[PDB]
Amino acid sequence: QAIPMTLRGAEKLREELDFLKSVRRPEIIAAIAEAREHGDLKENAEYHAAREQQGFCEGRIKDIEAKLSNAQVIDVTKMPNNGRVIFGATVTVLNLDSDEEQTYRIVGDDEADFKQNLISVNSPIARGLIGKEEDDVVVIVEFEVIKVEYL
């Protein structure tokens, strides 16, 4: 139960925990202190919006602590490039049919953002590539792993 997470991604998680803990949390409690000066809490809109945000953002905190409590932080920059796809690598794949060439970065779930070509290890494309190496054609259809870079 060690949970793989890249350095970029973990620094991004740790970044966040601070802003939420150090900037937003206070801001939210001052917002609540404030609307409390107006009593009638039941119908206090600014109070309910502030309390809403408190749950919203505190859950994100409880989450990041856990996430980071479980992490296995991988830095692929420190390993000799074998040409084999590992978790954290950057992979150029070529769709042998359409001839569609894309480069992706295999990452953990909190860091995953496929729209930004950052693919969660728990995805069909990461899965078909993980363990392959440049040249390996993989019938996941078929894509060719054009280049493996540890960045």
Strand partners, 92: 103, 147
What crossing angle do the helices spanning 7-18 and 45-70 adopt, rounded to 10°? 150
Cα distance between residue 97 and residue 22, in whole Å: 50
Residues 89 and 151 in one domain: yes
Cα distance between residue 93 and residue 146, in whole Å: 5
Cα distance between residue 22 and residue 16, in whole Å: 10
What are the backbone dihedrals phi and psi of residue 137, each rounded to the nearest 5 degrees, phi first? -95, 140
Question: Under 8 Å CB-to-CB from 87, ≥6 apart: which residues?
Answer: 4, 6, 74, 106, 107, 108, 121, 130
Please choose, from the candidates 107, 102, 111, the residue with its C-alpha nearest in 3D space to the C-alpha of residue 87: 107
Residues 83 and 62 in one domain: no
Sign of CA dihedral 79, 3, 6, 124: positive
Structure tokens at 44: 């206090």
Residues 35 and 81 in one domain: no
Residues 136 and 103 in one domain: yes
* Rounded (10°) CA dihedral 122, 125, 126, 131: 130
What secondary structure does DSSP assign to 88-108, as a single string?
T-EEEEEETTTTEEEEEEEE-
Q: How many residues does the chain have?
A: 151
For residue 116, give the H/E element and its range.
none
Distance between terminal CA atoms of the chain? 26
CATH classification at residue 80: 3.10.50.30
Residues 59 and 123 in one domain: no
Question: Under 8 Å CB-to-CB from 26, ≥6 apart: which residues?
Answer: none
Which residue range(s) make up the domain with 120? 75-151
Structure tokens at 133: 């190496």
Show the DSSP H helices in 1-151 as ranges: 7-18, 25-36, 45-70, 124-129
Cα distance between residue 121 and residue 124, in whole Å: 8
CATH classification at residue 8: 1.10.287.180
CA distances to 26, 28, 40, 42, 94 from 35, rounded to whole Å, are 14, 11, 9, 11, 57
